[PDB]
Symmetry: D2
Subunit: 265 residues, 4 copies
Amino acid sequence: HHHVGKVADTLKPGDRVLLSFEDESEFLVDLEKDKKLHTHLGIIDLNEVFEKGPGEIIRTSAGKKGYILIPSLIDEIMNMKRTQIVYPKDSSFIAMMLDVKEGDRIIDTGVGSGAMCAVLARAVGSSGKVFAYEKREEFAKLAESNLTKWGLIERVTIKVRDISEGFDEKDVDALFLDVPDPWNYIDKCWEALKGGGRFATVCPTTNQVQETLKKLQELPFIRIEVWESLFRPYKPVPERLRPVDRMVAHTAYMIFATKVCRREE
Amino acid sequence: HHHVGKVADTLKPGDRVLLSFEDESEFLVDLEKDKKLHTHLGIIDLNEVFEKGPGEIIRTSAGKKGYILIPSLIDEIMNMKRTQIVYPKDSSFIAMMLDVKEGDRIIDTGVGSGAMCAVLARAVGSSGKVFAYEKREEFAKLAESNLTKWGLIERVTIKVRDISEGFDEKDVDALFLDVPDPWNYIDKCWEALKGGGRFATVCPTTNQVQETLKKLQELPFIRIEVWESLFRPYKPVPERLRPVDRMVAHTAYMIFATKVCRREE
Amino acid sequence: HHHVGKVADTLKPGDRVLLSFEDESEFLVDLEKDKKLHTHLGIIDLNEVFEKGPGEIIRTSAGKKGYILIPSLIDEIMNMKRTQIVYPKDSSFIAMMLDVKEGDRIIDTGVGSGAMCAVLARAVGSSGKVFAYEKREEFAKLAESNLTKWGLIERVTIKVRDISEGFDEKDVDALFLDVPDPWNYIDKCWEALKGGGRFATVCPTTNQVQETLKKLQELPFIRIEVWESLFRPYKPVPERLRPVDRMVAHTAYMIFATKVCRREE
Amino acid sequence: HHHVGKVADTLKPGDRVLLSFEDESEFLVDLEKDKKLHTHLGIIDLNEVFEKGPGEIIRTSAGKKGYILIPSLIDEIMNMKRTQIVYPKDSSFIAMMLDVKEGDRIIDTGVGSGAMCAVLARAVGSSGKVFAYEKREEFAKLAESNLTKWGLIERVTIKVRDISEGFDEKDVDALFLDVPDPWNYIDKCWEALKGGGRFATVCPTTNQVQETLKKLQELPFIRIEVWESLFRPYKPVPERLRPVDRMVAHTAYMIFATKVCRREE
Ligand SMILES: [Cl-]
Ligand SMILES: [Cl-]
Ligand SMILES: [Cl-]
Ligand SMILES: [Cl-]
């Protein structure tokens, strides 16, 4: 039988659902009355979904068995319908390294699709705020749309502002920087951070890491660290457990630093 | 001059501070009037710290320069004065994979020092709750002490309860399991999860992964995945950028699954 | 001008050549008079190759520039026209770990395409020998053909023999085992090895590693080790040096052991 | 009983042996009459070794059980009594990528302890030759001593010569370069290689990789590749198989290229 369960997860018109099938295909869709999805596994009648609930079965016209799920933020970030993102394996780590916590004031720039922005927004809680600087109007509006859909827009002030003139905010708890040329903005980042505030940026190349580190070392920053991660999945076969054949080899070099007031008395 | 800055970061008696020095030694201490720290860099008079602020310099008796910092949760987890933990590189990822978010109800068991518990507590927000089952009284009390110090105890209900009889809660959003023998508890975990709820566990060995996967595959779980990560730091020398000589080779295999109501109609 | 250079590299009818183009496509072909290759870059007239030499340019009918090269053993193993192999990243390491050297007597079983066999054959020198047991006639003949083409057949005695009855040779220097069920052959391997002789095998799964280790530990073997390697290539762009986007995540777990005469006096 | 076995492995005065104990300590020593080794496991009387053979047991004065082994080249390279080396995980791979084979003429510079030199010497066979340029007399003599002990000196011509004036040899099959500043020698390397000859170098830092790649790209070289490898060992416990806690994070970036005669007709 249909369980009432968690009421906030009740499926209604306009909700996002994730339909997951035996061959591991997944479809992220907006629920709307009288919509049909045409897939390689057959037709899915979304009207049926309104009479079901998360964790329940849905069958295609061809009898293929799928399950109705509530998408996670990761699901949304990955099924991003497509631009460049900070991937979840990195964003989660970066948010913890930045110690983002309830009530924090955080600067994020640029914003892009809002994927990293969303992670930071979850972490600041209802009482914190992300000041998200994005001079590219098209991305400001994409992020606004995504963050709204993801239930996080109330926690993010999107500012269509060029950061060359500096940030408006002072004494922010942490700052994440993701721009093509981070070395050109490190001074402004330093100025915005509280004493003991935390800085992170991502660089795609080793050349960029080198240049960014040089700039950090010119300013009052300590505890400078550079990290990369490799995540490897395994075939979930109890009798034949082994890594998958191919993996992602690289997303980004992550650089962290802590602001101090001065180098010397 | 001393900047007022972020008022909640004001240093007072009983606060935790992190003192960070040029040779990269770091000391996590409770601030108390008239306490001195004796270190290989000299004596630090903590009375001085009350007249300073985060990001400011403190000198030892031997003239060595350090900085006063507010410890992060990572700092607290790592400077754990020592038992087995889920490391931050894993806990951050696991919390994001579990989609832990504002208002979520989460089961955590066992608890240990509370390191993973803390990550989950930050993620559920002020409106969520972590039900933390820990039958070992000594660890229940350690976790209570740590979570209190870390400003998170209001979000965690520590239950000194054996999980062999099942969990009290139903329809929880996600569940994290960390026990020596996770295969013996998967049924109870399934029962506690909402439809579409998310499960994670950690296993130190490949044998344990194999056994846990077998048990998951007997129950109504889909989207089963197994992950490991390797994190590599670099020497932050702009002119000689290269990985450090030695790294951590292994913490844990991470296993995830999503609860569904049934395998077949 | 055409340089005489290394005379043994002179191109003649029946030689293998590797033609390498700007878009990184490579074509491994047998040189024969009046043959043409039809490719996505145009037609290559192999008659032209006989009037050129290694390191020289060859143009397709469409004006695309390629270079004539002598294929390496790696090139031959990879451009294997297709069955399961031990990959070069592993075979090179395994041969060094086995200390394969001039004059050594080495057992190899099974053989397959002869890829690992070839590596061992190079390592034993002109005075050593590889005893290659391959009960599958089709693979015995493939390996014979490959090893002949690769100039190594004089160093390999291919024996179409079932290893269930043991090896004919005693006191061999090293032994490489690659079969679906290595645990069923470890006793026979031990019997064939000299005192202090070296054993290696490869296993695709962690389950197989576990079973193989159990069997090794029942016999007089010491210095038991298990290795895996990850090889990551980089984009060779001086101004934008970074890892390629995707890599191989897994070939094989490698297990090594050294034979001793007995566990106790 | 004592088995005659492989006669070339007979232990005699002046031979190197490796004594391997239960706690995994290993001692590489020169066998000499009336020598005793004093270790944390007790005294080993080397006179006893002359009455034993590889794979046989030797007991210390304190009753601890060890085994007599013939050291491998890896053992010799690692138990290097200490300077900078190319590690076996890299040297084996590099020698295969360079396609070093019977009869090849190979340039190696610098030489150092001769560790990489030895790998190349094994690979060229009795009919090939390594021209090893080492202007540092102390390292020329160390390498000569090591290569002699390792049975490879007949295959290596050590030249105490500065490479700034170029190499004497032309049309060599492959060349390995290991110097602090490889970009300053790439022209001379190109000049020495045959058409289709293979080049490799190692760089400790990403900066050095960038500079070396720039220089390669100025000259007639194709198939330029950059590789790194991570090797991870496992605890060989069948019931608790998992990676060791800590591993080597970095040895060297490996760069390869193939010489062609010219960039354009
Ligand atoms: Cl993003
Ligand atoms: Cl924990
Ligand atoms: Cl093979
Ligand atoms: Cl070396």
